[PDB]
Every structure is written in structure tokens, then in C-alpha cells.
Amino acid sequence: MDREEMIARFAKFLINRLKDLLTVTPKRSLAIDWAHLNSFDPELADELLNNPEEAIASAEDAIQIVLREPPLLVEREFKVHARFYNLPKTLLVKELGSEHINKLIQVEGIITRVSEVKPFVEKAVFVCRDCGNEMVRLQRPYENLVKPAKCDACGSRNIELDVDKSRFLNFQSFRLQDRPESLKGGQMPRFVDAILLDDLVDAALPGDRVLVTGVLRVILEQREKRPIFKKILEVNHIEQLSKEIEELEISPEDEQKIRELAKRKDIVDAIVDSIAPAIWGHRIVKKGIALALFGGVQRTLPDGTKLRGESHVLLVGDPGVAKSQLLRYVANLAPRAIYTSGKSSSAAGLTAAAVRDEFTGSWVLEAGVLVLADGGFALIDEFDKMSDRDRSAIHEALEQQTISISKAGITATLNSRTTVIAAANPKFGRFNRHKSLPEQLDLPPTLLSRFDLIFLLLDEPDEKVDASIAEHILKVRRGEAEAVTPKIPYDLLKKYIAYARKNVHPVLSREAMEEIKRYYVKMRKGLRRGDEDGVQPIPITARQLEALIRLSEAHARMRLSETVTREDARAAIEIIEAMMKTIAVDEEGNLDVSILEVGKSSKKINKIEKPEEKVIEAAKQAGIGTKADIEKLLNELKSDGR
Amino acid sequence: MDREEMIARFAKFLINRLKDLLTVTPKRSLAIDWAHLNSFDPELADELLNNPEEAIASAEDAIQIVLREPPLLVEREFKVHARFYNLPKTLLVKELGSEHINKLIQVEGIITRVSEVKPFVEKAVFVCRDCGNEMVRLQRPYENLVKPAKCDACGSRNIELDVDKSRFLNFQSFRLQDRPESLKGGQMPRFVDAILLDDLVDAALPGDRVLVTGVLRVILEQREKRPIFKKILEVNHIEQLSKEIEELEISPEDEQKIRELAKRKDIVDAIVDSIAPAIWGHRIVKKGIALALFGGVQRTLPDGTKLRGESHVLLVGDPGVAKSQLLRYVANLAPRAIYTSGKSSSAAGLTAAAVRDEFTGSWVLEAGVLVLADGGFALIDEFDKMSDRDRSAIHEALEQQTISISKAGITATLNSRTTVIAAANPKFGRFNRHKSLPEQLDLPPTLLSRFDLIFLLLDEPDEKVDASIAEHILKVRRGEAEAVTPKIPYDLLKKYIAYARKNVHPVLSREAMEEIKRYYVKMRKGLRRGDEDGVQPIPITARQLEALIRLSEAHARMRLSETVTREDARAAIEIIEAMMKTI
Numbered sequence A: 001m002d003r004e005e006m007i008a009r010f011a012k013f014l015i016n017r018l019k020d021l022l023t024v025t026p027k028r029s030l031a032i033d034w035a036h037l038n039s040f041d042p043e044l045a046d047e048l049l050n051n052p053e054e055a056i057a058s059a060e061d062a063i064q065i066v067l068r069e070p071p072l073l074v075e076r077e078f079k080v081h082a083r084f085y086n087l088p089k090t091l092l093v094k095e096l097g098s099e100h101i102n103k104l105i106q107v108e109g110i111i112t113r114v115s116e117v118k119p120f121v122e123k124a125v126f127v128c129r130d131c132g133n134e135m136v137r138l139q140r141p142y143e144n145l146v147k148p149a150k151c152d153a154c155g156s157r158n159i160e161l162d163v164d165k166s167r168f169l170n171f172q173s174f175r176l177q178d179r180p181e182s183l184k185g186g187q188m189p190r191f192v193d194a195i196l197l198d199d200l201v202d203a204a205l206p207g208d209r210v211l212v213t214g215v216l217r218v219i220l221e222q223r224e225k226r227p228i229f230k231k232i233l234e235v236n237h238i239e240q241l242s243k244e245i246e247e248l249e250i251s252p253e254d255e256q257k258i259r260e261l262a263k264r265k266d267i268v269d270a271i272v273d274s275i276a277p278a279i280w281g282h283r284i285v286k287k288g289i290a291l292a293l294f295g296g297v298q299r300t301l302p303d304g305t306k307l308r309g310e311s312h313v314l315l316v317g318d319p320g321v322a323k324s325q326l327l328r329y330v331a332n333l334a335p336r337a338i339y340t341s342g343k344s345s346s347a348a349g350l351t352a353a354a355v356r357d358e359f360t361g362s363w364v365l366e367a368g369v370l371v372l373a374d375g376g377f378a379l380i381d382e383f384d385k386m387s388d389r390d391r392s393a394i395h396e397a398l399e400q401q402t403i404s405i406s407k408a409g410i411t412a413t414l415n416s417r418t419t420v421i422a423a424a425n426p427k428f429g430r431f432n433r434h435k436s437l438p439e440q441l442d443l444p445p446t447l448l449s450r451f452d453l454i455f456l457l458l459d460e461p462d463e464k465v466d467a468s469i470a471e472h473i474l475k476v477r478r479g480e481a482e483a484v485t486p487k488i489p490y491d492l493l494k495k496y497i498a499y500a501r502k503n504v505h506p507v508l509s510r511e512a513m514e515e516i517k518r519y520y521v522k523m524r525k526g527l528r529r530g531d532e533d534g535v536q537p538i539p540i541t542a543r544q545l546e547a548l549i550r551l552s553e554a555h556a557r558m559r560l561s562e563t564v565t566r567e568d569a570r571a572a573i574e575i576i577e578a579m580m581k582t583i584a585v586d587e588e589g590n591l592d593v594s595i596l597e598v599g600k601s602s603k604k605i606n607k608i609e610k611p612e613e614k615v616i617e618a619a620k621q622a623g624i625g626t627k628a629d630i631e632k633l634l635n636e637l638k639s640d641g642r
Numbered sequence B: 001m002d003r004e005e006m007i008a009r010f011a012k013f014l015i016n017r018l019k020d021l022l023t024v025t026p027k028r029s030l031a032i033d034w035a036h037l038n039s040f041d042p043e044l045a046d047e048l049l050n051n052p053e054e055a056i057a058s059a060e061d062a063i064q065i066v067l068r069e070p071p072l073l074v075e076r077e078f079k080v081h082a083r084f085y086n087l088p089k090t091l092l093v094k095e096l097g098s099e100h101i102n103k104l105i106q107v108e109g110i111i112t113r114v115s116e117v118k119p120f121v122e123k124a125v126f127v128c129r130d131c132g133n134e135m136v137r138l139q140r141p142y143e144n145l146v147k148p149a150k151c152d153a154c155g156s157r158n159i160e161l162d163v164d165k166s167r168f169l170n171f172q173s174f175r176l177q178d179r180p181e182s183l184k185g186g187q188m189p190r191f192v193d194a195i196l197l198d199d200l201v202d203a204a205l206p207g208d209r210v211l212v213t214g215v216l217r218v219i220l221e222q223r224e225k226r227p228i229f230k231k232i233l234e235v236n237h238i239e240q241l242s243k244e245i246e247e248l249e250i251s252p253e254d255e256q257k258i259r260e261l262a263k264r265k266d267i268v269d270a271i272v273d274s275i276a277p278a279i280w281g282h283r284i285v286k287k288g289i290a291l292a293l294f295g296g297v298q299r300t301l302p303d304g305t306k307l308r309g310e311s312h313v314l315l316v317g318d319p320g321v322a323k324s325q326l327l328r329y330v331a332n333l334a335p336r337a338i339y340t341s342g343k344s345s346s347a348a349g350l351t352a353a354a355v356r357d358e359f360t361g362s363w364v365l366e367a368g369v370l371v372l373a374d375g376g377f378a379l380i381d382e383f384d385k386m387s388d389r390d391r392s393a394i395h396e397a398l399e400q401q402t403i404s405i406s407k408a409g410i411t412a413t414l415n416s417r418t419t420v421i422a423a424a425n426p427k428f429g430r431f432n433r434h435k436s437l438p439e440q441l442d443l444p445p446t447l448l449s450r451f452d453l454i455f456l457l458l459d460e461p462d463e464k465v466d467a468s469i470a471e472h473i474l475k476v477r478r479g480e481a482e483a484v485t486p487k488i489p490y491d492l493l494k495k496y497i498a499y500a501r502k503n504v505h506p507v508l509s510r511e512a513m514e515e516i517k518r519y520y521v522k523m524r525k526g527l528r529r530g531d532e533d534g535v536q537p538i539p540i541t542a543r544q545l546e547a548l549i550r551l552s553e554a555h556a557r558m559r560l561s562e563t564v565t566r567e568d569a570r571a572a573i574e575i576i577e578a579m580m581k582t583i
């Protein structure tokens, strides 16, 4: 409708926006604002949403005249795509339906899958020797194979493709899903597959918050029915979502009561009691999860490296200790949390992997729970039952917070900046106190060196602790008030965590620096003298020193304090000392578990032990171990071939 | 268009290049300069980028007349290829898009895969059993064998292949990637598949930075999948990258600043402090890494050998000593250094591998970090974790700087001129001083001799160094600048290594040769008798002194000195004597 008139209307609104483009020649696009066009010509901006097919084409040719007419006109009239980044309304992937088809929409979400840089032909010239050479059957990259039945010029059927005169363009297809931060309330990860064109290809990675704004197109992929079978959003402009929309927002009236709650006494005790009030006990585990929620400060050094600011927690224990429930109450309490299980229900269930799509068979990089939850939390239940592919990449995603996959024709790196509050189960049914943790845990020994807090939620029969948990469960089932309700409401506490992780950034103080120093040197020489003439036990490692500073800064952020008070660094010591008992202390002495084992004894005996009817007796009178211990030693040696 | 006019245009410009053609009679491809054609006719030269199919066809056909009509002509119309070794814009691999298909492009980069010689057909004359065998079809090397449905002469379908009259020509396919050293900031390992014709077959090997100038084709037609979405690149001329473009830039003002840093005092200690300022301690270890950065000179002796200048260093330490950190700060600081781990998911994470390609199932030789970083450094953490093929292949890459791989029909000999900065981890938990290193390290004993320096890092529970490293670690996290500001800027010190290795070439002096001959005989002959006869322990030795010559010349190159003075040799003793101290 009035295409020639729209060109004059677009040229009228077109000039400071085209003025800078007139200066920068290599810029192959033009970012146009809809609200700006709405102010100049509201009727013209209304035609953008109504008929986007005739509006984008007429605007491109119009601004071309606004380009050649003034000075600094480029020699070659490069394609000027009209990119309308802003729109009056912002839609949702769940809210998106068949009504917005062929309408200029602006849907927000997160990209989960993405294809390679697949070239596609724009002007499909078919080579017909008989006649009809330069004829073009304009095909879209998502559309199926186009082929004419007969040449209209000469009636010949010798049809073939002329890829020598064909002008090929770039094309990429991604999958836009609901954001797990706020749109997860619907509990439906709906997806709308979209396409990307020149200056849009390779503009966003999977697991990233983007605000795409394009035309909702359709494709008749199936011939079983005349109506469309699948809709594909033809993205006109892509843009990453702003910080305010992709993060939790707090009302100004709540900003006062959040600061008021920080000034309230025993704020640390109130938050601990407010985390999972149904489960009894585990106050050390509750405070450890609280320190993981109020994660430490994440700083970047000018040398290029970036200091870690997350505290991963692992909950190992026997079945029946409500270790899976603890991953539920925090799943809804945390601002950005993706509750999932260790089971590899998908190819990219835990870590992002590459899988061939069902549409064209091309490998697409699908994100995982450790990618969609970037800058948030990911509570992984049953962490001991994982696939071999996921077990190999979590070693890098937990420390470096990056997932570099370079297989299946997809090479890139993601940002796995997530706090993995996981919970694993022992492979022997119940955890034994006479064996180390990796001995009964399916996780690799190197993987345990990544978690800053590893609590042992063991089951121990005691008349005092069992009578309290028995009466507590009865109060929960009876509907008691103070047995289920938290001291701080979940709605306010969810904003309290987001307020601390965004505004309050504590810094180390001289008082806390002396406490962190005195604690680290105190653990040294704790058990090294014990295993002399061999591998001396290292009670604490510099890795754990960085974890101690993260927990000390975590307690200061939980109190909404801009500095690490000496009392805050002391609180992290108690939590570390409590975990010491669980592992690396109060068990096979210090250094227990460590990277693999204490070594104080096991490793020590390994070097002494290092047609075999003579070697079994030789180990007998040697006195290195009893006949039962030296028996089990060679079973593990035969496991590795020794 | 105007193909007849283009032939007259090319023949008009067609001078000195043809003068070279008469000199070398077997010249199947004559090289033509672009600036000579651009100055002759910019409109004619512009037609080469728009449609090179008709441009290169009319260019060779026009000079074919110049091959016959002028005197000294060839007896027949000898096939000549219009080779072009220059273009106005040199594009990049990541910058190359689908908008350059069917256009003459000039893209630079490195090669990682190279196939063998495949005698594919150029024009397959399909013989029909009944009649009509006269028909032909221009078979392409990148495309598979095509098959027409029926014959036009008699309409018969009894078609068969005729390998007698078919002209089979040489064909090779290679994979050209981005630069791993120059474009490390781009972080894009993208590649474009390319084919090599008769003149360019076996031209380069994987790990060779070349500057190809060809036409971006397209393989959109595929029998397996019609929406193949694949674009290939036919190359017209290949040429290795020049040092002006394939290395870091050093301006004359910058070269002055680098010379000014040499006039600055105590840079022999400031360089050690600047390398990885976040991690505390390791004065001798950090100085050893600096000693490896300014590697020794490489001189080809008249006897056929060459003095190795790649001073390999190994950092065997315990977990928690931040060894990996040291491999990170130096990787970005070094001019040519790519970070990689021991375990790798690719085909060749190391020197070389052999596996059939995914396109046609042909065996292609793959490349790794020890060849992509030739002329530089390669830092590999988890060096102890490596496959059986890795352990045997590196020994030739480290010591002899060569990669001899002839399996799977890929006859090739790569040159791995790399200075490796490795860091192994003993399998028996924490490293125990009581038992030796080879008992705790899976590395072969001869591999340890390849590393000139071996630092035994450790984390001792000494409250003295603990309180010092705890106060230092707190300073790094607190944001203190002193902990994260090097004595020499990272960008300035990166140019300091390139200017030192390229220009400064220290030569042996009497003062250094006497100290290197004194310190050798007071220690080698001192413990030569060894103990209890049998296999006597060998401290310093010929190979040790060799490495020791690298250590003395590295100190002179570190301070931008052409003469290795005795104190530069004395500084070499302080580092090598610590090696027997720590080990």
C-alpha cells in the first residue's frame, strides 16, 4: 500500500541518525529507533507493525536516496538493512502465538541452541542451457528446495542450479527459549526457532540474554496439510538484554526495609533459620548454603585473569537425611536458580554439548543448566550419577567458569559463571566413617578440589538428635506455625539476596587480613611431622585459602557491609573448621581426602608395597600391614594392573 | 562481459613477466603482479574480482596469443595459468564470509590439514555404449563424480566411464585456519577448506603460515544433502607469509623504548618481578621462564647440524602451587605462545596425528600446538597426562625439533621449532624428596634431559613463607596495585621479547667461554668417578653444557647485549646450580 508514498515519508523522517552513518562507510547497517519514527511520523511507524514486508523494503530504498543525495555518498550502494531495535511492546516466548505472524514483534528470551555459519543463496539463478538463465526464484534459507517444473521461455526441462552467478549470503539458525531467571515461573521452556542474516550471524552465543526484534515468518515444511506446520521468526535486529531487565528489580519502598533488615541484630542467625525451615538441624549446612547464596566479590585483575567469586557446595550423605529437599527450598529462594538432577536426561542436560537438529541434521550447540544459569545458581541433585561427557567439562566450568567446546563443527566458549550447590550420594549405599570421601563417592578426586564447602549429612542414631527431628517432622505435618514459616519471608529474602549480590561489594580489611593469615599459618605443620620419611601431609592448601577469603567476604556481604569485619572472617573460620571435621580433619588426621587422599598413610604404604606366591608371603613378615589389609591392597592394584 | 574486449585488454598489457616465461620453459603457471595490471587498467582489474571465472579464462587465453604470435614462440599453445600473487585487500579467515563467493579473494592464515596427491579428472568424457560418447562434462575436483541421466544423441542409457581419454590432473585439499599466534586476540579458530591444483599441489605443510590468493567457490550441490550449506575456496597462487605481516609490530619509536629499557638498571631482576606479579616467590623459577623467553641463537653449522635455541623448561610441582597461573601470565606475555592442556579432544592436540578426513575419507595429516607455534613458545599444563602417541612424538619435537610422520601415506616431515614451557605433576600425590623424580613422573628419563631447566615446585607448610604468601594472596584479592603491577608493562615487555630474539644475536666471548669451561670441569670431573663404580651419576655434562650455553646467551639477550660477558655466564651458573640444588 502506497509504497512510493512510504519511501517519501521515510525520506522525510531521515537526518542526524543517518548523519553518522554518512561518516562511517564500512558500517553495513543502520540502527533505527521506532519511538523516533513514531514522533516524526506516527502513521508510518504504525505500518511497520502492520505490514512489515512492505515497510522494511520501502525503508531500505528510501534511506538509500537519503544516502546518495547528500555529500559523502559511497561509490557502491551497499545493502542498508533497516534495523528497528526498539519497539513499543516487548513480547514473551510464552506469550508469543500464531496471532503475531507476519507482524513486527519484539520477543525477549535466552538463546539455547545455535547453528554454524551456513551460507545460503539469495538470488537462486537456475542454469538452463536451452533458455531462462538469469531467472531467479527467491528462496529463504529456512525454506525447502525450490525447483521449477518447466522453463516458460523454451519449454525445456533440463533444469539445474547455477551456483557460479548465484549471490550467496550468510545464515544462522538459533533457538530462543524463555529466560530461567524470571520466565521460569510458567515452568514451560517454550522455544521459537529463529534465523539470522548478514550482520546478525555470530552475534550471540547460547545461554545469553538477548532481545531480538524481527518478523514472525512461517514455513510449509510438511505437505500433509495446506496450513503451516512451523513458524520461524525472521530476526531483523538482535540486541543483548539490558542489566535491569535480566536482573531482579527492587522497589524503592523495599530498598529502605532491606537496609533496615541489615541494621537488625542477629541478621546472620535470622537468614540461616529462614533457609528451609521445614528440615531440622543442619545449621552448619544451612549457613554454608547461605554463604553460597551471598557469593563473594568477583574481581578482575589488570593482568587479564579474573578472580573467582563463587562458592560451590556439595551435600554428601546417606539417603533419608532430606538432602534433596535442601535443594528445593533454596531453588525457589535463590534469585536465579535452575533446579535439576544429575541424570543426563538430554545431550546437554548438565553441560552444553553438540547435537544434530531434527530439521536439517546440522549440529547445534545446546546450552545446559550450567550455561542458562550464568550469573546465578544451579542446584544439581544426584550429582554422583552423571555422564562421562559432563564429568569431563565440569572440571573447567567450576574453576575457570568457561565451557570451550570445539567439536561437531561448533567452536566457541561459554560463560558458566554459576554457583553449583550440588548433592551427591555414596556408591556404597551409606557413607562409612572408616573410609575417605572419594573412596565412597563416584565423583573423581580432582572434582572434589573445586567445591569450597563439602558437608557430610550423615545419619547417626542418637536419642537427643532423633527425638528432636521426630517431633519437628510431626509439627511440620500437623501444620504448626513457627515450624514451617521463616523469620524472613521468602519474597523479601529473595530480594535481599539480589540486593547484596548487586550493590554491596565488601572489601578486605586489615583486621580480617590478620585473621585469615593467622588461621592459614596455624594449620601448617599440624600433621606434616607425623608422616616423616616420606610424603608429609599438607593440612591446608593455598586453594582452600582462596576459598576462605571467598567465605569471609560472603559473610560480610550477607550482613550488607562494605568491609570484611574481623568478626566476618572469624565466622568463615568456624564454617571451614566445621567442614574440616567432615573432610581433611577429624578423619585420617588432617590433609584427609585433599586432592585424592591424605597419603599420610595410604600413599606411604603404596611406596613400601611397590607365580606371585612369594610376594604374598614377603608382605607378611614385612609387617607393613595385616593379612587382611595387604589383601585389599592388591585388589586395588589389580584394578589398575599392578 | 565484453570477453572479446578483455582478451584485447590483457594482450595489450601483455611484459617483464612474459620475459621471465621464455627463461623458464616448464612454466605451467606464470605469475602476474596486481599493481602492474591495476596501473594498466583499473576497470579491467576490477573485473577480476567481480567474475574471476571469465577473467582468468580470458587472461590466460590472451597471453596464449602472446605466447604464439610474437617470436620465440612455443611449438604449441602451451597451457599457462594466470597466477596472481597480489590483491588490494588481504582479507582474514574470520572476516571471510559468504558474500565473497565467486570472487577473487586474498586470505592469510595457517594450515592445519594437508591431503595427498589425488589424480582427479578435469573433463570426464562419459562413453555411451550405443552412441554419443562425444559428449563431455567439466568435472570439478571439489565435486564428486557426476552422472548424466541419458544421452542426447541416441537416447540410450547404457552409459559407462571412459578412463582412457579422460584427462586426470593432480588434486590436493588443505585446510587453512586463522593465525594461532598473531590472531590469538580474535579467539576464532575458524577455517575455510581449499583445494590445490597441479601447480600448487604439495606446496605447503600443516603449520605453515601462507598467503593464498584464490576464488571462493561453493559446494552447495551435494548428493548426500542438497542443502549442504558448504562453500569451498579454489586458490590461484600460494605464498608463505612475510615477516612484516606475520609478526608483532615494533615501531621505530617503540624500538627506541625497547632500547631505553636496556638502559634502565636492574632489568635482570625487574623482568623476573614483572613476569606473573600476582604469584609470590619463585624467584629462580620466574627467572628461568624469562631465560626461556629470550632463547638462544640458531646457527647452521657447516657440518649440517644446528644449535638448538629452544630452551625447554619443565615445572614439576605439587597441586596448589599456582603452577598453572605461571603458564597463564607467560602465555599472554610471550609474543608467540598458545595455551593448551595435556588431554585434548581434537585429532591432534599435539605434534601430529593421522586420520581420514570427513569429506572423502582420505587420510589428511593434522597439526597441533607444537607446529602451529613454530618460531615461538608453547605452554602445556598437565604435561604428564598424555597418550602413548603423544609421549613418543614430542621427544622428536622437543629435542630434534622435527616431526617425522609418514604413516597413512602422508609422507611429511614437520619442523617443530618450539620452546615448550611444560608443567608436570607427580602421580604419587605430593612430591616426596626421598625418592627420585623418574619414579614419580611417567615421563621418560630421556625426555627430562630435553628440558634445559626443571623446577621442583612445592608447597611447604613453613609458617614463614606461609604468612608471606597469605599476605600476598590477600593483597591480590584486595585489589592492591603493587601485587598486580609488573615492573615492565605487559604490552611493552611483549614487544621486548620480539625485538630481542629478532635483532639481538649474542655471540660467544672469551670471558664467557672460559667460565663455561671452568664450571663444567669442576663439577663433571668432580663427580665423574661417581660412586661404587657401575653406573656413576652424571651431574653437568656435554648436553648439560649445551643447555648451559643457551643459559649464558639468554642472559645477554635479556638485557639487549650482543656480547655474552662473564657475568652473563655467571648468571647462567646461578640458575643451573639451583637445578642440582633443588634436584
Ligand SMILES: Nc1ncnc2c1ncn2[C@@H]1O[C@H](COP(=O)(O)OP(=O)(O)O)[C@@H](O)[C@H]1O
Pocket: A278, A279, A280, A281, A318, A319, A320, A321, A322, A323, A324, A325, A326, A469, A472, A473
Ligand atoms: N532434619 C530433618 N527434618 C525433617 N525431615 C527430615 C530431616 N532429615 C530427613 N528428613 C526426612 O527425610 C525424608 C527423605 O528426604 P530426602 O530429601 O528424600 O533425602 P534423600 O533424597 O537423601 O533420600 C523426608 O521425608 C524428610 O521428612
Ligand SMILES: Nc1ncnc2c1ncn2[C@@H]1O[C@H](COP(=O)(O)OP(=O)(O)O)[C@@H](O)[C@H]1O
Pocket: A542, A543, A546, B278, B279, B280, B281, B318, B319, B320, B321, B322, B323, B324, B325, B469, B472, B473
Ligand atoms: N606464590 C603464590 N602466590 C599466590 N598464590 C599462590 C602461590 N602459590 C600457590 N598459590 C595458590 O595456588 C592456586 C592455584 O594453583 P594451581 O595452579 O591451580 O595448582 P594446580 O595446577 O596443581 O591445580 C591459587 O589459587 C593461588 O592462590
Ligand SMILES: [Mg+2]
Pocket: B324, B381, B382
Ligand atoms: Mg593445574
